[PDB]
From a paper:
The second comprises enzymes which function as explicit [4 + 2] cyclases, including the Diels–Alderase AbyU. This biocatalyst generates the spirotetronate skeleton of the antibiotic natural product abyssomicin C in the marine actinomycete Micromonospora maris AB-18-032 (previously Verrucosispora maris AB-18-032). Structural studies of AbyU have revealed that this enzyme possesses a distinctive β-barrel fold, wherein the barrel lumen constitutes the active site of the enzyme. Access to this site is regulated via a flexible capping loop, with catalysis promoted by the conformational constriction of the linear substrate 3.18 This mechanism is consistent with that proposed for the related cyclase PyrI4, which is derived in part from unliganded and product-bound crystal structures of the enzyme.
Residue numbers in the entry:
A (entry chain D): 10 to 141
B (entry chain B): 6 to 141
């Protein structure tokens, strides 16, 4: 009924970007490819995605970025896309956005992709929380 | 099950029992607000809780003209309280699409759980469908 996939290690195996991490700006973009590891560190899949910093939120100066990604797990695909504050990304805080099970065991399931950067341009901790 | 890792609460009928608002649903604008009181029902038509909440339309997103709206509510289920708050696009609210924002268990069964509150309007100023999805 409800499923939690905890991913303590997510590795960024390639990223192409013109993001200035110390000073991000609207218009900056990234395309990335990740590998995902379970709680005892075997491979559970890959993600491929991109993002774009889109606007400055006037309430807090947030640098609102749109992410879109396909997470190919070993027992089904999951699509995730939505908004994140890049000021949270770069200060190692958690972000999240909707995820939709696209096939396999994940057919029918919807919920949320969560992650926090543990290593600039290199690693993240992630969760995938799903229900039916 | 003891100490589930993940937990889904399905709310197929959420009735808005009381709403006070100055929102023009046909042409919404920044500064408009509502306060709402809801009753939550399971698949069997039993009442599982209530919600007390408010919202404010805060800003216009330059991307798409989205009307970004900040929600906040206290959801009292019969077995504990969940707080939830965050951003939703009022264009989605009014065209009956799903919206969501973070949720945090505050007491009872939900203490120490976090996840998301999600809902879709099924009738403006009348009713919605909803899900609370939590993890530990
Ligand atoms: C899922 C990721 O969301 C990210 O933002 C990110 C990145 O690494 C960017 C592609 C590079 C950019 C310069 C950056 O933000 C760097 C640090 C974040 C590290 C990982 C965060 C998940 C992602 O993975 C590639
Ligand atoms: C879960 C709800 O979150 C809402 O925003 C809402 C409402 O009904 C508003 C309080 C009134 C506003 C004028 C409106 O848009 C009315 C309907 C929205 C969708 C229908 C119910 C979700 C909620 O329930 C009270």
């Amino acid at each position: 009924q409800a499923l939690l996939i905890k991913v303590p290690t997510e590795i960024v195996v390639k990223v192409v970007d013109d993001v200035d991490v110390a000073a991000p700006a609207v218009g900056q973009v990234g395309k990335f490819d990740d590998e995902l590891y379970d709680e005892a560190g075997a491979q559970i899949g890959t993600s491929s995605g991109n993002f774009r910093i889109e606007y400055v939120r006037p309430t807090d100066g947030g640098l609102l970025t749109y992410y879109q990604e396909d997470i190919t797990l070993s027992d089904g695909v999951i699509h995730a896309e939505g908004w994140a504050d890049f000021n949270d990304v770069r200060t190692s805080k958690w972000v999240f956005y909707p995820a939709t099970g696209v096939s396999g065991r994940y057919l029918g399931l919807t919920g949320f992709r969560q992650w926090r950067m543990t290593g600039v341009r290199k690693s993240a901790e992630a969760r995938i929380l799903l229900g039916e």
